[model samples]
Target: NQYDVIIIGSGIAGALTGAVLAKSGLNVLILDSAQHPRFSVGEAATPESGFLLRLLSKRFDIPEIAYLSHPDKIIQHVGSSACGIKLGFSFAWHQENAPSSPDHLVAPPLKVPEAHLFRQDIDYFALMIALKHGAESRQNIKIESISLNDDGVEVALSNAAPVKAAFIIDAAAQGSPLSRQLGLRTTEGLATDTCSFFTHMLNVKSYEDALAPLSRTRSPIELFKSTLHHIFEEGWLWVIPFNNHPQGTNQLCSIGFQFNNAKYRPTEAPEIEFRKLLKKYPAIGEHFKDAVNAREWIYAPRINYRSVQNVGDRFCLLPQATGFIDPLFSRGLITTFESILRLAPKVLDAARSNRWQREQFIEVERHCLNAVATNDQLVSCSYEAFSDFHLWNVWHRVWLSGSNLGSAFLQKLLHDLEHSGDARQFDAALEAVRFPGCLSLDSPAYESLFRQSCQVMQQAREQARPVAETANALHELIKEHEAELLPLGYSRISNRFIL
Candidate 1:
């Protein structure tokens, strides 16, 4: 049998792409090695991710995609048990016996709140949507191999007849068959080197409980209502609660610890190492005092990979499949959605014309590479800033500035769509931007600001510059670009937090 497009891996990226293409009147086939409602990570959402989702829904005229756009919508349509509300991005610096200082970048007043996604539920929901749109899916199936031809590709399944497709999309990162078969995986040019151990848990205490006695600064929202991060010298911990909303029905929390592998070598079991770190920072340890691992901890010795090629004849790779830097800013989903945004339309056109050429999909490669490199710089710089609070304060502002600018760009696109009521306007605006990532590189000023900030942080790390000196340099750079940052709520250089 032949399919217009055969998508490998029924994860969010593949499922979402399948829904878009299948809804657009293409015969799409989604294949996965795992079954539905299974465990997975990359389980957080951001404003950019939500906006891109809604845009995809509008662009494809699929209301079901919109249903998964925000936390409220997911609750109303997909069920509250599948997600938690993300009010903002929260960070608390922790040191032994030191007062924990919290910083927040509150979610702007958009149409809806960001989400804390339960990947099992969300991925399953998306796969269902794709199937509902006439996409065929095969789960718990193994692919013996895939061969790309000039006209189409042949996918050989274990104990099943081979399938043919005009095009194939590889969405299984690390486990991607194309990556393995073609030797596309390479760690060269990648900057961040970190290991992670994470899992879902029940009865995880909120960070607020740990911060209550340490500081008196009341937060605009409960700390647990956001994607909370506990920062220390060599690594950070992410605490994403699924029970933060009043309407939420989940009692689970997503906990992950990332450590710079160079500084901290794994000498024992994951649980034992995690326990030792908790003891090292008693303040952060407070949240896990009574917490039990609801699931076995997953440890990755290395979490970063880059693909040398993302597009080939009759084939293309989604961002997740292409490469990943880190989950520091929750840009994984955003990049996925953005890549779909660019690739889906071309796919529809290809399906109509019956032409599949590698050259036509070069933009997808550019977008994936840029997103990975951009995220690498930001996350690598963040790990450097973790060494000093004073340096981190400035770096955080730079981070927030870029985030706000990206949001502002998305908001404009949305606003134009509403006012014009024409999807082409939205597409035109997005296409005009040269580089779109966690921070769009469309604006030269903003791009320069980000590049210089990363350089300064890099210089600080290499030179062992005084924290105050490095902070002042970053402040000056931000001030020089005050015009770009101020309107995006980067009010003051010394502003510790944004509410």
Candidate 2:
């Protein structure tokens, strides 16, 4: 059978893209090697991801897709994988045998909070919705080979006859089989070069529960309700709760520790290493004492990478397949959605032209590369800042102000476009970021702030600017958009601890 598009890999990106294409009255089929309703991470969501989800739902006339934008809506629609409300970003610095400092929480600028999706439930639900919208899906199907031509490509599957499509999109988190066939894998200059060991587990204690015995004042909001990040000099740990999974597939929480490869060595056993890691922060170790692993631990030698040849004559890769950075900022999902927004329109237009021209998709390749580079820089600088609480306090101001302001700008622009139908203005605003992915990258002030902060990251302790001086720089850099951050209850000042 022939399709307008054949999407390889039914992960969230491919499934969502397939859904949109199918809704456009195009024949779409999504293939995956593994079945859905499987355990997965990349669970946190920021305003960027939620905002795009809302906008894309309206743009594509698929209101159901917006279910993920709000926390309560997730449980209402997808049942429980026991996800939580991500009201804001929460970070705390720690050391061995000591209680972590008071967490510096950064709430969303908006009154409402975003969600922390349990990807297993959310992704499976998304796939079901895509199927409901007329897209075909196949599980346990692996592409054996691909034959590309000017008109389309012939995809031969392990358990089925050859299928044809006007174009094939590779959305595999690892570059797709087709991309490998083309020898496009590369990781030469990615900012993050570390590895990760992670697992989902039951009985993991909550931050509040763990801190109770340490005489620390509890957070005003439930700390577990937010995406809790434990940062140290060498690396960081992520604790994401899915406390409400009805079927209990997700258990209590998802945990992962990313190690700076240059600074640490792996243990013979990942579980042993994970325990040893927790012992380094006793406050956290107490909490995990009774925690039971929900499944086998998994390790990735390197998480940051990219495929060199992403766009072809009749095929292209989604932003996720193009590259990945550290999961510190939850950039993965939003980046994927943003690429889908841009590439989907172009692909559909190409189908309308009756020829999927390579030139028409060149912009996507450029966009993916830029996003990857931006992520690499920002995340690497962030890791560097983690080496010192003072550095992190000052350096984080750029991220705090830049991200919030960008979200505000994007929301307003999208709102105007939705109401006034101003395609020209919308296009111009989108072009500011080069692809409407990372709003922070589009702001000159933010870009300058990032470079300056990165410079500070490189300086020796004594040579670095005083916190007060750095604070002044960050303050003025974002003062133009200070009003946007005010509602979040932060002054956007870098010298002081922000709640």
Candidate 3:
């Protein structure tokens, strides 16, 4: 039997895409190598992600998808144990035996908090939503071969009959089957080089509890309620707890350590390396004094990959499948939602009109590539900033400014959609802006600011300029364009933290 679309992963991206297409009367099939309720990463969400989630939910008329946008909605609609309340992002520069001060905290409005997603639960729920809407799904299956032609795609499975579809969406991350078959993998333009070691753990102490001295003067919101980061010169660690709320059921915390591969090559086992790092940073070690691994650590020697192509005559790759930089700033999920928002309509149009031209999907390819490139610059600059707090502070503001502006733009679009009741108008406005990703690249001022900042950071890294000199140059650049960033609450340079 033929399918309108066959998605090559049951993860959030694939499941959400399946849900949207299937609900719109297209026959969608979702296949995954692993079953639901399995552990997965990319566990944090940002305000941009939430905004995109709300937009997708309303635009697709999939109300269920909106539940994952905010912590309150997830706890109420999904199970409370399935997610943690992410008030905001919390970060602190770490040094051995030093108090974790000079920290930074940024939170969205209290009315709407971001989420620390348990992807296992979230992905499973999304898949069920797709299934309920008439999408067929098969788990524990692998794609043996993919035959893409001008008319349709025939996908051979490891243990099942081959399925034909008008198009295929590869949502599998890294080593994706379609990417392999098409020779799409390329490390050509990537700038970030890092390794990751992560796992879930129990009895993980909160930063606030472990470091009472720092907590007393910290932001009002509990640090653990946010996606907390412990940063050093060479790398950073993330601590996302699922039991931070009063009525939470899960006692697991997601812990991930990422470092520059050039600086620290992994020689020991993941656990050994993790232990050595913990001992190296006493302040970070305190929070994990009693933590026990809930699962074995998964290590990746390299965490960056890019694709030469993301769309073809009868196929397109999801953002994750297309490429990835780093999880810093939680761009992974936001990129996924934005790609879906852009790609879904294209897929639907092709399916209904029987036009499977590759030219029509060029915008999808452009958007994916732009998103990957922009994120690479952002994350790469961030890693360079990690070397010094002064540099990190300026770079953080640049990031926050762009992030805030982008969210505001999307929020206004959502508002207009509500008031006008015209999906076409909203789509027109969204397309008019043509944001590559969460950052508002359409705004010339913002685009210049982002580009210049990236250049300054890159130059600093390349030239080995004094940290203070580089930071001052960034400060002056930001000051010169103060008007552009002022509305976003980025005017005060000394104000390092936001609540």
Candidate 4:
């Protein structure tokens, strides 16, 4: 029952955390309320799953025999178009480019060291089996549950006596007793208007003339695959394809409903609405004309969308949160994994050494959380803009990308939207402010401090150097403290976004 660490909710988050801790020579206890592969609606993971693969294949000492009985390949991919159509977006690629954001310091996780997009019913269960086996295989680790005291935690299980651990993580979704017990409220005003659909199958995509095209587009049916995007007014959907054992290929089709956000609740059956959409995309429906595959699907309406408060404490929420945001950017898994990778050392240090050693962990977590939460709408806008170059997108991000507008009054909008569920755009203009480290903020100061500064010619091109050239005849400076002004970065220019 007792362990060095107790992890609750044995989904991807808990299992991975337990796996890492067990491999690190620490005794870990993983406790779950449900049986293995207990299906939860809206349940899933992102390409971030590759992180564990790389970790085991490299860092962790877990035996190769324990790796999933699934496909074995450094590179894998999947796709989903109507009727198992071969779409470009479904395929996988090893991309090196980093996504653009103001804060590169906080890179949104999924760097895709390698990716596998699974919609195969077999793949999901295969993964669940792999996680369970890999975690429970270690003698030093076992599953247990929900009580905590001076000794650590007491986790209650149905058939077994209460298990114990030094610390616990609740990876369970919403209605999490852990969050309630801890006296924390991470999210308010759940957006139940959106629904998620999940299904899996074989041979979602393969380049072969023999294979009949399920969905008809100009070129291929798999246009929904990969980052090759498709945008519809209802919402943006992703059709990812990946490789797996036995079958070699499969894909998942994920769609987030937004158009109905104001009109309906998320509880609607995705199967019904999803099928209705097929009628609109007749070619898409026909593409699957001969399609004959079945898999589990659910329309997740709301999830546990908030994090905990570790502010002023040794362990902060950002890196130590039990759980957070939806799978929009596939950040759910990435954030959990990132927390372990970036903060586990601090956790260990605080547990083994002293609380002071955990300062970095606390600071990093709080700051990251604040930054992310602060930019939610901004993030949403930018994301929508990035995916769809439509009017909303333009109004939301791109045009706003460069606009040198300020939004001091807009602070309340963000605060209310976060706390009160004011999802309305309440559109506001934002200043084009670039804060890329101190150096990036003031490039002129930075360049002179290091590089062979040139570009001063632009200043020299002024109508014969104002106050410096003919200072004696100057008609008094227009403004005081002119020396405070400096040149902006050559790489970055001023952009103006209009609301």
Model 4 gets an lDDT of 0.36
Off by over 4 Å in 3: 96-111, 213-215, 486-489
lDDT against the true structure, each candidate: 0.81, 0.74, 0.83, 0.36
Q: Which candidate ranks first by TM-score, i.e. highest?
A: 3
What lDDT score goes with residue 461 in model 4?
Answer: 26
**Candidate 2: residue 88 Cα off by (Å):** 1.2
Worst 10 residues of 2 by lDDT: 102-111
Off by over 4 Å in 1: 96-112, 213-215, 488-494
Per-residue alpha-carbon lDDT of candidate 2 for residues 1-499, written as tens digits (9 for 90 to 100): 3888999888788888998899988899898888876877788888888887876786677887889788778877777553666766667777665666664433232357777787877888888878999999988887788888986889998867889989899887774677678777788966677788888888988777776422454444566767777888778898888773333334668888898775676756888888788778876675697889888988988888876768988999887777888888888887788778778877888888886777888777877877777777778777766765655665677677667766776688678878987655664466556333444645665566556655555453337546556445544544544453435534444334344
List model 4 lDDT by residue over 275-321, tens digit each: 66555443234324444335655455543354545433322333324
Error of 3 at 192 (Å): 0.4
How does candidate 3 fare on TM-score?
Answer: 0.96
lDDT by residue (tens digit), candidate 1, 1-499: 4888999999889999999998889899999898887888987788788888888887888888888877888888888898998878777776655655553222222234788998888888999899999999999999988999887899999989999999999988667888888887888987789989999988888866765622554555667788887787789999999998888899999999999876677778989988888878876777887788889999888999888888987888888778987879898988899899989987877878877787778777888888888899999889888877767766787877777678778778877877788866676678778666639546777788889999998898778888788888988998888796646446464455564
Top-lDDT candidate index: 3
Ranking by TM-score: 3, 1, 2, 4
Candidates 1 and 2 compared: the better one by TM-score is 1
Rank all candidate structures by their lDDT, best first, as comma-separated numbers: 3, 1, 2, 4
Clashing pairs in 2: 81-245, 82-242, 82-244, 82-245
Return the TM-score for each candidate structure: 0.95, 0.90, 0.96, 0.55
2 or 3: which has the higher TM-score?
3
Model 4 worst lDDT run, 10 consecutive residues:
101-110
